[PDB]
Amino acid sequence: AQKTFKVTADSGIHARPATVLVQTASKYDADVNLEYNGKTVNLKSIMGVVSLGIAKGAEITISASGADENDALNALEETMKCEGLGE
C-alpha cells in the first residue's frame, strides 16, 4: 500500500530525520520505499533517503509491501506527524 505526504520541516530531510524514518521502517518485514519526484529509494537505508535532498514543500510517497505493510504505513505516518516532518 502507499500514502502521499507533504514535507513541512524547514531543513527538509537531512541525516537526522532520515535516521528516524529508517529506524521505524527497519522494524517491519515489508519492503518499504520512499518516492520523490520520480526517484524511488529503500526506506531502510539512511544514505538512500539523504541522497534525495528532499526539502520543505516536497511531496513524497511512502509505500510498504509485505505482511505488515498496513501497520508499517501507520507507524511511518505517525513518526512523520509527531516529529513535524510532514503530513
Active site residues: 14
What residues does 60 pair with on adjacent strands? 5, 36
Please, which residues have CB within 8 angstroms of residue 16's CB and are 6 or more apart in sequence? none
CA angle 30, 36, 40 (to 5 degrees): 45
